[PDB]
Amino acid sequence: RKQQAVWKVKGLAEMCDDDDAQYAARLRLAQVDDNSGVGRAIGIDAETEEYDVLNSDISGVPEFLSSKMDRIVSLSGIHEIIIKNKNVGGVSASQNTALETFYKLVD
Amino acid sequence: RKQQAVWKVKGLAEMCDDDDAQYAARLRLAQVDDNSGVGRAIGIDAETEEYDV
Amino acid sequence: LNSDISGVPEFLSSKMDRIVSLSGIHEIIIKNKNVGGVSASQNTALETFYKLVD
Amino acid sequence: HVGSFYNDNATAKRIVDVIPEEM
Amino acid sequence: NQETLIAVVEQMRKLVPALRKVPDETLYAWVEMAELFVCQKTFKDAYVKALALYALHLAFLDGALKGEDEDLESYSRRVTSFSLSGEFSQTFGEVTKNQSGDMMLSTPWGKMFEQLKARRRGRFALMTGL
Amino acid sequence: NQETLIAVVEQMRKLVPALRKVPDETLYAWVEMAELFVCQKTFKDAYVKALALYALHLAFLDGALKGEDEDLESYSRRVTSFSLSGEFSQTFGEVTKNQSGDMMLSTPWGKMFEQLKARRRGRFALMTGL
Amino acid sequence: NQETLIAVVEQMRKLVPALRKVPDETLYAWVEMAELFVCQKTFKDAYVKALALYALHLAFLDGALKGEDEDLESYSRRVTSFSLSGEFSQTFGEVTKNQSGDMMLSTPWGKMFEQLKARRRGRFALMTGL
Amino acid sequence: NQETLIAVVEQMRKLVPALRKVPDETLYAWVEMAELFVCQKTFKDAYVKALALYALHLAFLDGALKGEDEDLESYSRRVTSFSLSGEFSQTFGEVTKNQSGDMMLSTPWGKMFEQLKARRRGRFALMTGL
Amino acid sequence: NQETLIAVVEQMRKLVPALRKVPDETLYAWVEMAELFVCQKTFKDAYVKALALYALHLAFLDGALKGEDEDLESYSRRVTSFSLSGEFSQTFGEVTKNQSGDMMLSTPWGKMFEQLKARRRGRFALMTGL
């Protein structure tokens, strides 16, 4: 949920909620949102109907997830290289220098 | 709690708070918030109902 | 009406990182893309995979 | 029951089995 | 149906007196006209009362019932006052000013119907595409 | 029920006099109409009084009770003033002006009912999806 | 068609009395003019009633039916009041004020037609290019 | 209780004279109606006086006491002026205009009750979930 | 107390004449009613004068003292003008329009009490949680 497009009509509560009118309106809405985008336009009748778009943001989610994984690593008792199974987290060392703690634990 | 969608209706405090009307309204709200997102739109009746985030 | 695309690539990279962590194989093998880290000797990044294979 | 958690989660399985195999 | 028409007309005459003198056929026509707008599944048990309220609202929207002999001119205009020499005088005015340019808020029957609909189903339309 | 009808009518006649002369059947019809809107649960012990207040509010919304012989024209219009030559004169006006276009704030009974509902349950609707 | 014209005229005469005295040809002409605006696929069953509502709305828009002998001047002006010495006096006024400068909200038939169209199809036009 | 009713009625008759001529049963009914709204734990000692103030406010909200013989029409309308030929003339008006559309600020008793409640408990509701 | 009542009544009669003819019991009742609102620790020495000012304010809020024989109707309405044929004529009006919808700013005694309270303690409430 990053963008939401809200469609307003003047008279929309005067529907049987199960008749052909709702079916046609929902089919029209589905087709219009399927065929729209950049380079395509929508024709809106004035003084009876509007069209708005609401936005959001995703700022610091990956850092939050990395912090939670760091807590898991801290509680588990095993080196982050083993659990995350991803090097490059630190600068390129010789080799065993990062794994000495794990080797001591294994010993 | 990063985003909150608030739904406003003109007449909503006239229900018994236990009859079929509340059940239907809550089911409709659940389905609508389940099927919405990016690429999906909501139809709102003007002059009687709004939708904010 | 305009919009924006701010942090999608980092989101996708984070999800791929979760896949790498769960799979049990080094990121070099799965992502098949070096340069992720600085230029090392060679086998230094692949020692974990070699230990797993042994 | 820890059996279901061990079976379903890969992280718990790795945590349990990483040490004995290395030894 | 047929018994529904008699029940609705009887309820209309019970709620408002002096409608009994009106011929039955005009009330039937107004009831069938009102039946186009009112739903049935939502109101369920209160269908007859809802139909009577809507029929009354349509009959007293801005003055539509009128009579057999009312002149054709009076349908686009009204008389504000009238007086006959030195015998008597009289002035007339509107019943209620509604700020909002919305129908169903011009007569008490419309308000009653609106609140009944709000109680039984509600006044909203929340949809998503198919 | 039945005894509820007599209790409600008797309470309405106790609160407002001069309604005793009205035939009992019209009051019964108005009470059954009012019963659709009011809910006993929330009100619990005060059910009869709440029903009486709502029935009075519906009876005096914009002028609905009227009478047996009132002409059909007077339901969409009122007489502002009337005078008979040199005998007497009289002028009329509305009882009050409500700024908000909200029903139940047009008569004192509506305000009393609204405050009673606020005291017993409240005026809000806070929901989440199922 | 032909039977449609008779049905529509009969419905108009049923809804509003005192239109029976109007010659049939004028009603036919007004119905053919109204048929240009009303759709048929959307209304389906209610075609006759929708046509009657639209024809009535066009006939009572701002005063268009008039009569055979009405003077040519009265089409750009109205008389507000008229009195004959000391015999009688009379004043006239408009039927209603619509805040919005929108046609179809000037007469009750226009509002009824608008709500019928909202009930059956709706008031919107959502389009994309071909 | 019972002695509370006599004490409250006597206090109302003390504060406002000319209410002594009103039959005792009507005052009892109005007091029981007022007792639904007034709390007891907050007011404590001043319960009788608070009940009297609320009962007076309800009795003089917009004109509710009326009388035994008052006509049914006068409950939705008032007379602004009346004159009898060349004998006498009289004009009538409202007692005060309240800008805010709030009940309890229309009569002096309502204002007194509001300030008493503010003095003893206060006008606020600060809540947190359970 | 008792001597306080006599002192307050005597001060009220000293400040405003023509209140001497009023029976002593009604003044006592109004003084006890006013005693509920006025504090004592803040005013200290000026307690009697503050009580007299508040009693006068409550007695002349919107017209509450009235009299023994005043009709019940006049408590929700007033007479704007009155004239008896060709003998005499008279018109009436309000004393002062207060822009703010605030009580204690409608009469000079209320303003005097407010300024006395501002001088002795002040008009503020600065609190922190316990």
Author numbering:
A (entry chain T): 215 to 321
B (entry chain S): 215 to 267
C (entry chain U): 268 to 321
D (entry chain T): 32 to 54
E (entry chain F), F (entry chain E), G (entry chain G), H (entry chain D), I (entry chain C): 2 to 131
Structure paper excerpt:
Siphophage T1 is representative of the T series of model Escherichia coli phages, which has been observed to infect not only sensitive strains of E. coli but also some strains of Shigella dysenteriae. Siphophages possess a long, flexible, and non-contractile tail that plays a crucial role in host recognition, cell envelope penetration, and DNA injection. Connected to the head through a connector complex, the tail of a siphophage consists of three main components: a tail tube, a tape measure protein (TMP), and a distal tip. Using cryo-EM, we resolved the three-dimensional (3D) structures of the icosahedral head, head–tail complex and the tail tip of a laboratory-adapted fiberless mature T1 at resolutions of 3.5 Å, 3.6 Å, and 4.3 Å, respectively.
The T1 connector complex is composed of two dodecamers (a portal and an adaptor) and two hexamers (a stopper and a tail terminator). The density maps enable us to build the atomic models for the MCP gp47 and CPs (gp48 and gp49), connector complex (portal gp52, adaptor gp45, stopper gp44, and tail terminator gp42), and TTP gp41. In addition, the entire head–tail structure of T1 is also conserved compared with the widespread lambda-like members.
